[PDB]
Write a protein that binds this ligand. Sequence first.
Ligand SMILES: CCCCCCCC/C=C/CCCCCCCC(=O)O[C@@H](COC(=O)CCCCCCCCCCCCCCC)COP(=O)([O-])OCC[N+](C)(C)C
Ligand SMILES: CCCCCCCC/C=C/CCCCCCCC(=O)O[C@@H](COC(=O)CCCCCCCCCCCCCCC)COP(=O)([O-])OCC[N+](C)(C)C
Ligand SMILES: [Mg+2]
Ligand SMILES: [Mg+2]
Ligand SMILES: [Mg+2]
Ligand SMILES: [Mg+2]
Lengths: 380, 380
Amino acid sequence: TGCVLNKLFQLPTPPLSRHQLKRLEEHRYQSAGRSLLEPLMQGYWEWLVRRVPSWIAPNLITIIGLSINICTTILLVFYCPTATEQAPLWAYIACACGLFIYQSLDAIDGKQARRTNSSSPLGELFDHGCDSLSTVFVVLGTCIAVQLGTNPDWMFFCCFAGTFMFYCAHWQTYVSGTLRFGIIDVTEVQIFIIIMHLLAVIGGPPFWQSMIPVLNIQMKIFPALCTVAGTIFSCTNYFRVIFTGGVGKNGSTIAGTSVLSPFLHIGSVITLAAMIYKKSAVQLFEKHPCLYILTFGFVSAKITNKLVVAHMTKSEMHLHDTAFIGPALLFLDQYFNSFIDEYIVLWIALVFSFFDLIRYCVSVCNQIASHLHIHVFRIK
Amino acid sequence: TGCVLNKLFQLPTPPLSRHQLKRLEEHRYQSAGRSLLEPLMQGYWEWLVRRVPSWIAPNLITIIGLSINICTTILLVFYCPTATEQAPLWAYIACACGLFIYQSLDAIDGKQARRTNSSSPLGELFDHGCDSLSTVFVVLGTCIAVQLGTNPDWMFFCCFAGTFMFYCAHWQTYVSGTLRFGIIDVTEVQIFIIIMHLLAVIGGPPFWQSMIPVLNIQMKIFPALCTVAGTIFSCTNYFRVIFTGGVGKNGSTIAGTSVLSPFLHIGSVITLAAMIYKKSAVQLFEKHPCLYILTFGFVSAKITNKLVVAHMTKSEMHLHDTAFIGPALLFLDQYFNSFIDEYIVLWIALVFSFFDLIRYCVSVCNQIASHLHIHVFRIK
Ligand SMILES: CCCCCCCC/C=C/CCCCCCCC(=O)O[C@@H](COC(=O)CCCCCCCCCCCCCCC)COP(=O)([O-])OCC[N+](C)(C)C
Ligand SMILES: CCCCCCCC/C=C/CCCCCCCC(=O)O[C@@H](COC(=O)CCCCCCCCCCCCCCC)COP(=O)([O-])OCC[N+](C)(C)C
Ligand SMILES: [Mg+2]
Ligand SMILES: [Mg+2]
Ligand SMILES: [Mg+2]
Ligand SMILES: [Mg+2]
């Protein structure tokens, strides 16, 4: 049983060459910046990390957070598959508490890693790889909490904008070699989403459906407008650095590739999602938005994880990836006038994309661990 | 002017690494077999090659043949763009004479190369690369000569079957390391096509439209049926060797890749052509068959040329290639309910695919020539 499962979760050929592997050992973490709310939260996270026993490995801490976040959001998706129903109030509380636990466990893992001298490139790759999956669930859970499914175009834009900003942060890191935090960053966004779930508990759908008298727009559209405002601010900071901050030869990226090369990958993901949405004869996204977001979210998360790998290995990005097979199944089916029900194809695309993501992640983590002679979830 | 044109016909990165280049020098031509009509034709070709002066380089001989073949077929396409009209009789004669000149010039180039001690890997790569382009024009010219445009499904099958058999011959060479000639091969097929053009001169459309009394099928369908019969025979010889003749480790190909890997490339070409045909709302192939065959013919010829390169460099085949961009343009347009007229897109796809083919061929030939310090069309 263990032999068949192990063969299932690794690709037949190793994804990284030995030369990238050697170059990965030379990586040194560099960040430059400070968010607005981080210094107040620093005292809590410094207190919290001291209470954690020294035998818990970093990669085990992050995955506990993600599992809590996944389970609470999947339960919420189970209650509200079209994002139009009202869930029991405790489900939003569970997501609110789950995200708070996630944020607290995430922010202490690198501090714990330093305290126990277990900082390693596996931990850094695993963290950003875990953050990439969690972000998909955060934007989906938020959209359910605000019932954004009644306005699919706003739901489509906001969910894919959030994944694109998170991708752009790693794109900025791929260009400049340094993770740069803005004035409004992950800390403020996550805290705002936690507070938003409690107003959804207190006021429900009637509160969210009320009209803002001065603008004659529904208040429910305001977080989506906040997402627009956030997108301009976040893109402006990243793109200034994208055009001026290339550390490679002749101002290229650190890998020596064109500064526009990551755009093609995330652009293809967003474009495929937009074509399949606007061409669907059965209005697949409007009837099944959570299932749709999860399908393309796993595709987007993997493409982000390849960018993290491309950063960590100082390698080019190949546009051709198996992650696009799932969207292509949806794409080919809709091309033949939906000969199979797109809902069935979407489930097929979901299951494939999930397993393909898991197969990649397990194979990369095991390969790095075998090279460094460390265990992923246990400190020696 | 020369600098801008030179930048246009080469890719920014060299298509072959130095290690493939070194391995290319170790290649030694091996063939095993004899066609039925070749020994009678051998005396003519041995006589003909002795009349050629020793200063004409091999690669210059092949390209003169191809240019004659291209010009006569393109003129025929110009007179009969839907393959339903009747051309002047001299145009079929010109194609008949042009193909006869082609065959005679092709068959003597390697004999001339041996006589002048100018045999080189550039010549072998250029030859099969030239044969791959010529075959597309031969099947198209044949279909015009027999007016197969009145039965598009037969026209589609026969043209793509011929390209697939030619691909399969190189696939067989990629598997077994040796070019193997059948009892019915290129010599018999080309001579049969030459004779067929003269009956089209003598009898015209009324002859070709006459019914075969015993079968109650039109006689015009018989060459297409001959193409079916030829396909079974040719595939049977190639596929027996494909399953038993792998010289690589554990019976794999000589490059160590799966024996099914070339199938995906030619399969994708044939499948894309079939999807675009059956989905076209304007019946693009039925109104414009020659333009359609030329578009996908250049795509197919390039994919064949990559297989020759993959053979000559002992390398794997990458499925991702720029050759598919042109078909994808047709494919994306038809997906959006033909927002642009597919005929305009087909011209765009033709021009792109032609230039992309020419760019690849010029870049590969110049790269090999620079490494071997030889000139492509001149003997020192
Ligand atoms: C709700 C209000 C709307 C807009 C408000 C303004 C938003 C625009 C502003 C933001 C600009 C900054 C870019 C965004 C974050 C990327 C930063 C990054 O590198 O990732 C981080 C991970 O990320 C996570 O922790 C997971 C993401 C959680 C929420 C999802 C973010 C998408 C935005 C959702 C919004 C739309 C959803 C709403 C639905 C309609 C880096 O992780 P780390 O640094 O290794 O972690 C430990 C270190 N730490 C302590 C420093 C963290
Ligand atoms: C018309 C009757 C229908 C069917 C009849 C039976 C067909 C089935 C049987 C054939 C089985 C054999 C496979 C086919 C040939 C591949 C061999 C190869 O390696 O390529 C050769 C090149 O090829 C050329 O010279 C160009 C091709 C010319 C005609 C196109 C062939 C496609 C079939 C069109 C038919 C459909 C079109 C009709 C439209 C309806 C190798 O070149 P070479 O060896 O380096 O050249 C010099 C050496 N030489 C002297 C040895 C040559
Ligand atoms: Mg963290
Ligand atoms: Mg993190
Ligand atoms: Mg020849
Ligand atoms: Mg030849």
